[PDB]
Design a protein around this ligand. Sequence first.
Ligand SMILES: Nc1ncnc2c1ncn2[C@@H]1O[C@H](COP(=O)(O)OP(=O)(O)O)[C@@H](O)[C@H]1O
Lengths: 77, 512, 521
Amino acid sequence: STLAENAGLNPISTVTELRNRHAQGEKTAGINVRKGGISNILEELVVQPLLVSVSALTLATETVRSILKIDDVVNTR
Amino acid sequence: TDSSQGIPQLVSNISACQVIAEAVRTTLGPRGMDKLIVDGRGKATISNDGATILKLLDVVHPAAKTLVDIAKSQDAEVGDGTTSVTLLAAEFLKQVKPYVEEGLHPQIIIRAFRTATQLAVNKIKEIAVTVKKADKVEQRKLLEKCAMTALSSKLISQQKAFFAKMVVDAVMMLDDLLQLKMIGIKKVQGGALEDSQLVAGVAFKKTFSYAGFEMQPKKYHNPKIALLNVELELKAEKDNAEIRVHTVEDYQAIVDAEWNILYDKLEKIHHSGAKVVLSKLPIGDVATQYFADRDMFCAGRVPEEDLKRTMMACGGSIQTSVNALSADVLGRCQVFEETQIGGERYNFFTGCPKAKTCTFILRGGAEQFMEETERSLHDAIMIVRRAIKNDSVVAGGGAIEMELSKYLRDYSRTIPGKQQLLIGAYAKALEIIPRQLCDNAGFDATNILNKLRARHAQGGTWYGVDINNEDIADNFEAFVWEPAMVRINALTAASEAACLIVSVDETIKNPR
Amino acid sequence: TGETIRSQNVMAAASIANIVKSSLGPVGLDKMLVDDIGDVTITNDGATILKLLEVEHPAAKVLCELADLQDKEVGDGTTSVVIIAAELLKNADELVKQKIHPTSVISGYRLACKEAVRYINENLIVNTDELGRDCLINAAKTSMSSKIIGINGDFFANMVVDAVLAIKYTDIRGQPRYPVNSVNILKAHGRSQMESMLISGYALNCVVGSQGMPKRIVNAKIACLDFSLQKTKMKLGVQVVITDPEKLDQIRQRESDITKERIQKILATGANVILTTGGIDDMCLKYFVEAGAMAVRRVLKRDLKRIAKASGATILSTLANLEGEETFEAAMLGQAEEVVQERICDDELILIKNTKARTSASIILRGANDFMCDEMERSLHDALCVVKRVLESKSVVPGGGAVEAALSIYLENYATSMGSREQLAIAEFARSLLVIPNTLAVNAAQDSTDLVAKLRAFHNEAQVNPERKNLKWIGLDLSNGKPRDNKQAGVFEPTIVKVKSLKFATEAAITILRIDDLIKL
Ligand SMILES: Nc1ncnc2c1ncn2[C@@H]1O[C@H](COP(=O)(O)OP(=O)(O)O)[C@@H](O)[C@H]1O
């Protein structure tokens, strides 16, 4: 949604179209920036490792659990 | 305690007109928003028409008063084009506002506006195409295409469209006006076996039944409606008045003295020929028995609209006397039938010598379907009347303003004077119809105006706008048109209103 | 936040741009600047105002920095860029407020600028001279302010065009260089203004107080000397350590006996007259007058520098100090052809005929006001600048404000033919181009609403009916509010300057529009 908003198109409609395409043909396309439409990623030479997402998600979940488990009162000196 | 003359007065007038312009704006398209209006009494009403809202609102401003007066005059003289003229005037004022504070005399823009209006009128007259009995062989194909265009505005059933076409074609005899405000329409309540029925005559509503109501004949050979304002109820007549109470013989004496005059009056009013009594007040208990004993007809509880329709169809005369009547101010019918359907008793007055009104019964057996789905048939019959009466026609929608704006913009590039910017602003201000039509439907007008301008840059056809499919299609093939005479009058009225607004420079007040 | 700081930056840019607005063109009022001390400076130059002005806004600071960076490499065109950027910002503010992504209008502005550059690059002039520099009757009257004399301006224009076309220069071995610029002048008083002559070879300073040279024969070449011999000390070269109270009376005779061989070697081949500055004695001249060798006095540093930079005969290669016992080479010898002192303007000046390398013309003024030295000098400077800027680069455009209308019309046509999301941006860019003719008409005390309308109506005919591309390009006038053809008598301007100015303005507008918030994050 943030990418579609920064590109200059309708974010809700693009998100709904992407969800429909994912529910229909599983792996279809994504969001393009250079052309400004919905094109397949297999033509554009752009990839990223899986660690940059797995480690990020694990760190975010750990931080959320740490900030949720901390409560009570915050005493000071 | 402060007042000016010139630029501040015009600015104040524009600001006052903008209020009444923004007050009514969303009610323009076919699916506009509703508005609830209530006064100091305590009763509220929901309406969506611009004329009803403008009629139930008063402004203490001279410019707004003149504007609403011009709008009311245009709506009364024509019948279509009340909010569009106001929006055009508001856009013209908004475009002329920045070209006033820069030190410009408004006496030089009136000529430019008049020339632009004349050029637009000439272009519309030279671009309008009329067709009326010149092709499509016999008129059967013409009426078939007319019915198809009538049913193309709203997606309804085929039988309903056929019944609407029949009820709109079976009423074209002596009607020579340009509006359906003569015969009118009336929505009934209840249910039946079929979906819709048609009949020629005056209809009626629910009638209260009593004991022995089947004594009157159901079919009449030559009935005559008794047009008498007096009624025969227990409250009207009397059997005992101011008399000395002693025994029972005085009661019989006074009741006979009253019944003598009653019988004289009834035989005098029945000897003229009238036998179908249509009393306004409901009947009692002994009046029905007295009417059935004399082999006559009785009724009660009838509205004024039904009486007016009966007087207009059967040709009755207004009688302002009870007794001493003649046999020339009475009505004459032919066939009077009483048929009960469901949980009500319906009446049929078929055989009127003056074929004027016709009943179009629309009962499906529900309580919400009667009130709803009532504007579609009205729009269909209005389009049918406009296509039958008027000769000139053009493609409707937002396909006639863009071409005029492009023509004005192309013509403004061949004048070496101060009128160039004036004509440019006049052409730019003409784009307010399709943008508002797209904004009222919850769409994106920015994605459609660019496509319309790209298509009208070199095509010049009848490509308008869509609502259902949300795209750009040809309005000439969508079976939607509009007369080429209302737009000219609306533009002329808007130009006259703009000139009258820009001509006022200041006001003069007087205490005493 | 968001849409507020952007409006504030736009307002600040408009306020800082509405200061040098009433100072564009040659007709403008003056501006006073105070340094918050007590002194006041009156100037009407846009560059001097933009350079001497306090700033405190980041957007204004970066705008001034970009303007300075543009002015460091481009001569003129540093004032209209700020107005163009302000107009672009005030036109894009409404687009942003109308719920439009700034990337769309940025791409539209980029496409409009590219289309304008492509259309400009296809409208140039191949010829560099038309019947002798615009018929040599129109290219000199517009570049010369005639307020006291104008009846006999044809002769002055002919003299100017002759002086600028008869002499050329070439040194880069790739393109013809500009001719002479620092020509010699002679201000006279009480002369016939209705008569003027042109002679070849510039003259030096007037010899006053030492005109005892019987010039009767025609010489060949001459020489030059920077220092001067003297008994006692006076200039640089005399030693201060040698203490001799009796040798000072015989140092002149010793120096003469030493330089006798040098003078004898100079007298060979063809060299007689030498050039010596002030500080020489008359006894040496009286002793050398019997052999044929003399010396012309009244020599300054400017004349020596001009001689060294003209013919190329340098002296530093061999001589440097007072030691005159150096080698004898042809570097310190003025190889000329004829040096005669004719009778001109009732005077006897050094006249060098047939000068090598360069050949300058002696421009002698007439008896009038002292301002005549500032009347033809500016015209000659403009002429040499034109012939040096349009020579190596044939990218010139006619007029000054007659090209924005056609560009705006072409941009509007392209926006109408496009029909995409970047449609209103090109229209706004085309509308934001009529700010220079309007300002020029306002500063000239004329009606801009009628002038711009007439200019657009005249320019639309050249694009509707394709008939020609060189004619039908009329523009505005400075004398009165009447359209005049800027081809037969107009002044051309370099197109590269305008292209760079437009590119810098577009870059500044894009940079300002790309700035979101200014909060300390
Ligand atoms: N004879 C003329 N006719 C029409 N316009 C002229 C004439 N002389 C000068 N101008 C205009 O005056 C302007 C002077 O701009 P200038 O002050 O040099 O800008 P900057 O200060 O940025 O260098 C030029 O843009 C030119 O178009």
